[PDB]
Write a structure and sequence with these properties.
This is part of a larger assembly, with 4 copies of chain A. By secondary structure, chain A is of the alpha+beta class. Chain A has one domain (1-514). Helices cover 16% and strands 23% of the residues of chain A. In chain A, strands 1-4-5 form a 3-stranded antiparallel sheet, with no helix packed on it. Chain A has a two-stranded antiparallel sheet with strand order 2-3. In chain A, strands 6-7 form a two-stranded antiparallel ribbon. In chain A, strand 4 (35-37) and strand 5 (45-47) form a beta hairpin. The longest helix of chain A is centred in the first third of the chain and has 13 residues, at 89-101. Chain A starts with 6 loop residues before the first strand and ends in a 5-residue tail after the last strand. Chains in contact: A-B, A-C, A-D, B-C, B-D. At the A-B interface, strand 19, helix 8, helix 9 and strand 25 of A face helix 1, helix 2 and strand 8 of B. Bound molecules: sodium ion (5 copies). One sodium ion (NA) is lined by residues 78, 80-81, 83, 411-412 of chain A.
Chain lengths: 514, 146, 146, 93
C-alpha cells in the first residue's frame, strides 16, 4: 500500500526481519502492528500479518547442495500463552494426518475409511491433556458447567469394568461431530443441552461456540447456508476419548507419535477450533489438499516462477491441489486482523431452531397515558384526559430467543479476568483492588478504538509459575494510564436518589488526553 | 485551564488566559490500598451467579440470555430496597440434580417482573458517540410500577 | 410490549410474545391545567436577565457571551443552596445610567467562581448520537471545590 | 455451624478422646485421620464456592493434579505444599 494512508497507520515500510544466530539458525520476526486504510470505520484497508515459504540449502565441503523446506505464519499477539486451546492447530494437523496420511496406521484403516476399535489409548498422552485444557478456560472465561469434567469425582485412570458406566456418562456428554452435508441441520452440533427435563440439565461438552453460530440457513440469498452452532473436539480427539470410555487404555509411560516436539511447539500455540475464522489461521488448515505429508505444507511453484510472474491473486490452494503460494495461509482472515480479535469474544446462540442463528426482531410498544384530577372542591368536576402513544423497532440480524451465552476462543481472546495490581500506585491507576473478575477489554468501547489501542491490553499469566498444580492467573502489564474512569451512580440513570447507594464503573479512552 | 488563540491575522495578538481550580474530598472510613477483593459467605449470600431462564418468555422478562455470570442482587440498589424486596431474589440450585458429579447451578424462581431494565450506552456517560457501540445493563425497581 | 420474529426460513415460525405493564403516579398538591406562567415580584426577585461580562476573563468564568437572556438563579439548584449562597447572585444594574431614557440593565457583581458548569449533549439524554449537535447549559455548585 | 459445635466439643467436652488430650490442652499427634470422612468434604466444599463467587485461586486445591488419597512418603512433599498454603489460626490476644 504505497503513499500515505488517510486512516490508521500512515506508512508501510516492512513485513518484518530475517536473522541468523551465532550458529547460523534462522529467526523469522514479523510485523510491527501496522493497520491502515482509506475508508472510515472498510474497503481500502491492510495489515502487517503474513505467511510463506521457508527454503533451506545446506552446502557441503565437497560443494554439493541439499535443499529442505518449511512454512512460516505471522500472528496477532497471544495474550495468555500459558492457557491452551482444547483443540490446537497441532491437533488439527495431527487429525488431518491420521485420516489422510497414515500418520498412525494402528489407529486408522485408510482402506475402510474408519478408525480401528482395537487401538489401546494411554491416559497421560491421549486423555489427561484435554482434562487439563478444560481446567484452564476458567482464568479467562465463566464456564462453570465444564467443572464436572476435571473434578475427579470418580477415578479417570481406573479402567476396570465397574468404572465403565462413570466413564460412559462422562463421554456421552461430549458432542459428536456433524456430517459435512449441505442442508442437514438437525445434527448434534446444533444441540446445546443434555436434556430439557428439570433435574437432567447440563450444556454438552465442549461448551463453546462452533464454526457458525452467526449466520442462518437463509442468509446471503441462499436457502442452505452451512450451520454449526456448538463446539465438538476433532475426530481424532473424541475417538481416543471413546477408547478411554470403553476402557481400551493404559496408565504409565507411552511412546510419542511420529511427530516432532518442534512441530507441535509452534501451531500447538495456535487456535484449532472453532474456525469463524479463528485467530491465526482458518479452515484451509483442515483440508488435506494443502499438505504433502502430515504437518508438511505443499509448496506451489518455484522462486523463478514468482521472480518472473509474481503471486496469483484469484487462486484457491483448496480448489487446485498443487500446493500453497506465499500468503495463502492467512488471506481468509479479516483486514485488518483487529476485526477477528474484536469478534473473538462471546456469541449469543439460538438453541431452539436448528437452522436459525439470527432473525429479524420487531418490537411494538403501545402506551395509554391517563390523567385524573381529585381533591377538587364540592361542585367542581374536571374531565379526565387520555392519550395513546406507539413505538416500533425493527432489527434485521438479531439472535433468536432462547439464546445461550457462548464463548469464542477464551485462551486467545480473554473476556473474564482477574485484577493483578498488587501495590498502591497500580491500584490508583487501575481503580480496582486485586483479585476481582472484570471485563478483559474494559475501556475499549469501539472497533476503531481496538484498531488503534490493541497493545494497551493485558497479558494473562501465572503469578505462581514456580509452584506446579497451584496456578494463580491475573492481568499483568495493562497500560492503565490510557483509560479514564467514571463511577456512575444508579440514580443518574433512574432519577431516583435511593439508587445512588449503588454505582457502576465506566472505563473509556479520551482522545484529547496527552 | 490554559487558553491560547491562533490562526489570528498579521498584526493581531490576543493574550493567553490561565485559571487554577481545586477540589478536596475527605472520607473517614475507607479501605487502605493495597486492597483485596474478598468474599463474605458465598453459600449463604450469592454474588456471582449464572442466568437460568431457558425459554423465550423468561429471557424477555430477565433481559439476559442463559448461562451468563451477573450480579446476584442486580436490581436492588439500596439497603431499604432489600428490606422490602429480599423475597424477589433467586434460589441457586443444580439443574442436573439427577446426575452425580455433573452439577449445573443456575438462578431459579427470580421475580423478574419487579425489575425494570435500561441499556445505557457508554457515550451517554462520556459525550463521545463512538463509545455508543458498547452499552451496560441497569436494573432497578420502580416504586410507581403496579 | 409485543414481539414478532421474521425473515425465518421456509416452514419455520416462532410464536409472538407480548406483555402488559403499568405505572401509577399520585401527586397531592399540583396546579390544575390549564395554567398560565405568571411572575411574583420581578424587580425584587429577578428571573429572566441578561449577562453583562464585557471582557475575556469575565466570559471564561461566566461561560456565556454578553447580552444573552438566561435564568437569574442558574447554578442554585436547592432550597438549602439558596440559604447558603444567596449573596453570590448578581445585582441588575443600569449600565447606561449616565444617559437618561436610554437604559441597558444587565447582571453585575455575580460570584461566578463559586459556580461550576457542564455542556450536556442532548444525545447523552436521548441515547441518539444525532442530538449531540445541540447541547444544554447546566450550572451547579460543587461543595468539594476549594 | 456443626463444625463449630464439633470443634467446641473436641477441645472442651472430650467428644473424641483419641483426637484431644484435655489434661495437656493439646491435640494427639498419633490420631489416624480418614480421607473420606475428615478430608474429602473440605475439598468438596471449596469446589462449590464457584457457582456463587469468583474464587479461581482456590482451584488448585480440588484439581487432583496429585493423588490426595496416596499417603506414601514419596507423596508427603505434595501433601505438605497443599497444607502449608492454608492459614494457621490466630492467638486470642
Ligand atoms: Na473469548
Ligand atoms: Na493461548
Ligand atoms: Na458472599
Ligand atoms: Na448454603
Ligand atoms: Na419574580
Amino acid at each position: 500500500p504505497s503513499g500515505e494512508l488517510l486512516q490508521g497507520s500512515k506508512h508501510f515500510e516492512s513485513l518484518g526481519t530475517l536473522r541468523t544466530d551465532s550458529q547460523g539458525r534462522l529467526i523469522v520476526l514479523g510485523g510491527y502492528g501496522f493497520a491502515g486504510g482509506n475508508t472510515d470505520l472498510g474497503d481500502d484497508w491492510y495489515d502487517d500479518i503474513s505467511d510463506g515459504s521457508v527454503t533451506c540449502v545446506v552446502t557441503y565441503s565437497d560443494d554439493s547442495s541439499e535443499t529442505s523446506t518449511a512454512w512460516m505464519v505471522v500472528g496477532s499477539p497471544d495474550f495468555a500463552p500459558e492457557i491452551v486451546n482444547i483443540s490446537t492447530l497441532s491437533d488439527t494437523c495431527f487429525d488431518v494426518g491420521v485420516r489422510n496420511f497414515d500418520l498412525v496406521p494402528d489407529m486408522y484403516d485408510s482402506a475402510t475409511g474408519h478408525y480401528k476399535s482395537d487401538y489401546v489409548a494411554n491416559f497421560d498422552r491421549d486423555i489427561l491433556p484435554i482434562i487439563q485444557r478444560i481446567s484452564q478456560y476458567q482464568w479467562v472465561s465463566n464456564v462453570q458447567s465444564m467443572s464436572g469434567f476435571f473434578s475427579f469425582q470418580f477415578d479417570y485412570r481406573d479402567g476396570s469394568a465397574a468404572n465403565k458406566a462413570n466413564r460412559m456418562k462422562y463421554y456421552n456428554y461430549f458432542r459428536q461431530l456433524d456430517n459435512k452435508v449441505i442442508g442437514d441441520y438437525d445434527q448434534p452440533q446444533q444441540v446445546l443441552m443434555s436434556s430439557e427435563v428439570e433435574g437432567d440439565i447440563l450444556p454438552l461438552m465442549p461448551m463453546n461456540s462452533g464454526s457458525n453460530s452467526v449466520s442462518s440457513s437463509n442468509f446471503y440469498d441462499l436457502t442452505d447456508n452451512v450451520v454449526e452452532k456448538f463446539l465438538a473436539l476433532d475426530a481424532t480427539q473424541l475417538f481416543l476419548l471413546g477408547q478411554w470410555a470403553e476402557g481400551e487404555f493404559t496408565a504409565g509411560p507411552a511412546d510419542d507419535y511420529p511427530v516432532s516436539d518442534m512441530d507441535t511447539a509452534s501451531i500447538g500455540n495456535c487456535v484449532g477450533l472453532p474456525m469463524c475464522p479463528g485467530i491465526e489461521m482458518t479452515w484451509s488448515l483442515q483440508n488435506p489438499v494443502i499438505y504433502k505429508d502430515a504437518y508438511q505444507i505443499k509448496h506451489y511453484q518455484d522462486k523463478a516462477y514468482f521472480d518472473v510472474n509474481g503471486l496469483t491473486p484469484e487462486r484457491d490452494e483448496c480448489e487446485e491441489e498443487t500446493g500453497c503460494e506465499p500468503g495463502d495461509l492467512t488471506k481468509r482472515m479479516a483486514c485488518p486482523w483487529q476485526a477477528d480479535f474484536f469478534n473473538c469474544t462471546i456469541q449469543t446462540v439460538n438453541f431452539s431452531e436448528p437452522s436459525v442463528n439470527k432473525a429479524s426482531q420487531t418490537e411494538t410498544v403501545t402506551s395509554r397515558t391517563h390523567y385524573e384530577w381529585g381533591n377538587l372542591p364540592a361542585g367542581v368536576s374536571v374531565p379526565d384526559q387520555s392519550s395513546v402513544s406507539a413505538t416500533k423497532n425493527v432489527d434485521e440480524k438479531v439472535p433468536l430467543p432462547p439464546a445461550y451465552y457462548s464463548y469464542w476462543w477464551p485462551p486467545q481472546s480473554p473476556w473474564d479476568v482477574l485484577t493483578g495490581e498488587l501495590d498502591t500506585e497500580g491500584q490508583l491507576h487501575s481503580h480496582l483492588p486485586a483479585g476481582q473478575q472484570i471485563n478483559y477489554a474494559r475501556g475499549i468501547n469501539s472497533y476503531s478504538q481496538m484498531v488503534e489501542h490493541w497493545s494497551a491490553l493485558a497479558f494473562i499469566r501465572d503469578r505462581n509459575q514456580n509452584n506446579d498444580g497451584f496456578p494463580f492467573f491475573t492481568e499483568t502489564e495493562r497500560n492503565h494510564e490510557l483509560f479514564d474512569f467514571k463511577e456512575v451512580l444508579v440514580g443518574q440513570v433512574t432519577g431516583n436518589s435511593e439508587d445512588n447507594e449503588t454505582s457502576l464503573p465506566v472505563f473509556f479512552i479520551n482522545a484529547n488526553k496527552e
